[PDB]
């Protein structure tokens, strides 16, 4: 009956929140020093946005962000977490003698009740490629508890996409798929499944990092302004792109990364997952074309990245791209929920 | 049905989604020990398949049914509940075996077969043999088996042996001690260290090891698939009494399994023992909460009790003591969520 349960298969939500119940997964994100340190930097450097304020922390996990809000002078912090990690968060609140300022509220942010409106919302709603997990809609949904002119940390999110050339990666995945090309695997002809194997392997986004020399054009930006957007805006995301090739060669796909900005009263702090920046636990995301497109320097590669939200808390991505000069055209579908962790 | 009564829907969804991926079929097929030995057992016992009715429980891509056809099977019913059954049908057609291999999508507890069979083939072994609870579907399929019919595999042996691995034991606390700091970004996390320790010890460790860490001849618990009922797997009590061949600290029990294809011509063995070439099942180890010192010649007695649960796996209770000293330890592990430590 809640916004969450109507857009989410129970089976998906069970494993999703089960994953976040593990302390080792909290450690994994907390050890990302770029992510944790930049979050603390954004909050403390903008202490004026928290001093004697009312705060809501959506998906607080162990509560680290609420503790940062407390360090910045918050009057009262509501820390909403839907996994069993909420129990461990309450333990930390009591062991750090902050019961008078951090109030853990177990449950989904779409289902819990708060005693008052808040001045500012803090959260880490970013999945890999930004949009995975569909936590951004929960983050936006929480704005029902936000006073007018209330702030949000992060405030905006920039999605970047750029074409890349990586023949080794394309061959690595093509070689994997060519296992189903064998006409006599122990005497059995698999070749009929060759096509379906290619589809499956190339639907997998490749999550790892890469040298920036593989990019063949200036990135295109797609901005989500969390102060303005409605959760309905993320059900069908359409990202048009028109790249201007800076190098000639084979475009094997598009690389993705994201930045979020904490636009506070003292300064704007950026948290970037770009390949030009130190590595984070989000890495970067690349979508492979089944067949690379050939482009010349000065050519334009135009197309559209259409992200359709599914009830498994992820997106089905369709990427169509064409070299305008030759009409060479590539269409691809990706299952953002089945990534290939290559690093 | 029998299957749905013992399985939570959330677990069954994610379980069959996993087996819907051609890449996961490929992972098992590429295991030469696994695939080769199954082929060897079926072909070298051709008289058990020549002009016979065959049932294949959980056929996946159908490789075992093709092996049964190579051995001269008259009619092969291949049952698979995951969407991989659609790919099996494709391979049946492309291999011109539609007249001999009938693919039936669905659970073996729910589908309908038109005739009894002479022999049932299957790969129902999970890691530690019992994970996935496929052995119960394999045994449940005997309602379609003609009297005096055979089963490939015919018996399953799970082996338990005590091991010493100081490094493995200590790394649990090394990982948990991340929480043992009084100011992680100004936050005191020490209150969750105990919860982190417990979380790691609930995880069986899936990887391989040098056989020199074993300190006693293994104890063997046999399941005879011809005689056993699926009720025999809801509660598996494995008493053990190890005659210690070496002196040292026993940190837990190591698990592997063998399986036998008792054919009319010969008996073929598929083994995942650490003394054999590695397989995709690796081996499984369960730690004691505390190590037990045992002199070479002592007896280390206790029980390993596996209790089936509705997550298609088992809760593992282990108690052990050094009889000559009375020193005791135990542990309780969740087989459904192991740690893949292999590098």
């Amino acid at each position: 009956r809640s916004v969450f349960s109507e857009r989410t298969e129970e089976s998906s939500a069970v494993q999703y929140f089960q994953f976040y119940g593990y302390l080792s997964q909290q450690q994994n994100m907390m050890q990302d020093y770029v992510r944790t340190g930049t979050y603390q930097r954004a909050i403390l450097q903008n202490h004026t946005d928290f001093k004697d304020k009312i705060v809501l922390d959506v998906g607080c996990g162990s509560g680290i962000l609420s503790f940062f809000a407390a360090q910045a002078g918050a009057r009262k912090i509501y820390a909403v977490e839907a996994s069993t990690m909420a129990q461990h968060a309450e333990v930390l609140v009591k062991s750090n003698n902050l019961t008078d300022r951090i109030v853990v509220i177990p449950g989904k942010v779409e289902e819990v009740s708060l005693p008052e409106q808040v001045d500012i919302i803090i959260s880490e709603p970013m999945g890999y490629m930004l949009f995975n997990e569909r936590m951004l809609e929960s983050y936006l949904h929480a704005k029902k508890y936000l006073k007018p002119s209330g702030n949000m940390f992060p405030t905006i999110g920039d999605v970047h996409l750029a074409p890349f050339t990586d023949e080794q990666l394309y061959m690595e995945q093509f070689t994997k798929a060519n296992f189903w090309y064998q006409p006599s695997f122990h005497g059995v002809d698999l070749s009929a499944l060759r096509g379906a194997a290619v589809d499956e392997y190339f639907r997998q986004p490749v999550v790892d990092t890469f040298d920036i020399r593989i990019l063949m054009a200036k990135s295109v930006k797609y901005t989500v302004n969390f102060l303005e957007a409605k959760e309905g805006d993320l059900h069908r995301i359409e990202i048009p792109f028109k790249f201007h090739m800076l190098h000639s060669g084979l475009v094997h796909g598009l690389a993705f990364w994201f930045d979020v900005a904490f636009i506070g009263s003292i300064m704007t702090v950026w948290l970037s997952t770009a390949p030009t920046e130190p590595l984070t636990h989000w890495y970067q995301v690349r979508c492979l074309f089944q067949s690379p497109l050939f482009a010349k320097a000065g050519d334009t590669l135009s197309g559209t990245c259409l992200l359709i939200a599914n009830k498994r808390q992820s997106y089905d991505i369709s990427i169509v791209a064409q070299v305008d000069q030759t009409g060479s055209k590539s269409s691809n579908l990706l299952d953002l929920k089945n990534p290939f962790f290559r690093y | 049905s029998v299957f749905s009564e013992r399985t939570e829907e959330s677990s069954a969804v994610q379980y069959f989604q996993f087996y819907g991926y051609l890449s996961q079929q490929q992972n098992m097929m590429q295991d030469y020990v696994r695939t080769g030995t199954y082929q060897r057992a079926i072909l070298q016992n051709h008289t058990d398949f020549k002009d016979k009715i065959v049932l294949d429980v959980g056929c996946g891509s159908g490789i075992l049914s093709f092996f049964a056809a190579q051995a001269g099977a008259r009619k092969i019913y291949a049952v698979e509940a995951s969407t991989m059954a659609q790919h099996a049908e494709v391979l049946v057609k492309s291999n011109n075996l539609t007249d001999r291999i009938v693919v039936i999508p669905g659970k073996v507890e729910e589908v309908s077969l038109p005739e009894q069979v002479d022999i049932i083939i299957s790969e129902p072994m999970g890691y530690m043999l019992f994970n996935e609870r496929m052995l119960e579907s394999y045994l449940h399929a005997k309602k379609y088996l003609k009297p005096s019919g055979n089963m490939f595999p015919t018996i399953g042996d799970v082996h338990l042996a005590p091991f010493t691995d100081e490094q493995l034991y200590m790394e649990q606390f090394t990982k948990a001690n991340f929480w043992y700091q009084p100011s992680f970004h100004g936050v005191d996390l020490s209150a969750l260290r105990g919860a982190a320790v417990d979380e790691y010890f609930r995880q069986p460790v899936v990887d391989t090891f040098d056989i020199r860490i074993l300190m006693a001849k293994s104890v063997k618990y046999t399941v005879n698939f011809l005689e056993a009922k699926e009720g025999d797997l809801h509660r598996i009590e494995i008493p053990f009494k190890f005659h210690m061949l070496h002196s040292g600290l026993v940190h837990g029990l190591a698990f592997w399994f063998d399986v036998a294809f008792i054919g009319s011509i010969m008996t073929v063995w598929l083994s995942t023992a650490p003394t054999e070439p590695l397989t995709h099942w690796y081996q499984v180890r369960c730690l004691f909460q505390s190590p037990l010192f045992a002199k070479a010649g002592d007896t280390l007695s206790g029980t390993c009790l596996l209790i089936a649960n509705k997550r298609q796996s088992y809760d593992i209770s282990i108690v052990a003591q050094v009889d000559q000293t009375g020193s005791k330890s135990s542990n309780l592990l969740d087989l459904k969520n192991p740690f893949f430590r292999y590098t």
Binding site: N28, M29, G127, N132, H281, N338 | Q14, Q17
Partner: peptide, 9 residues
């Protein structure tokens, strides 16, 4: 069936 957050370091 993968993990929401990738393993890191």
């Amino acid at each position: 069936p993968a993990a929401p957050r990738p393993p890191f370091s």
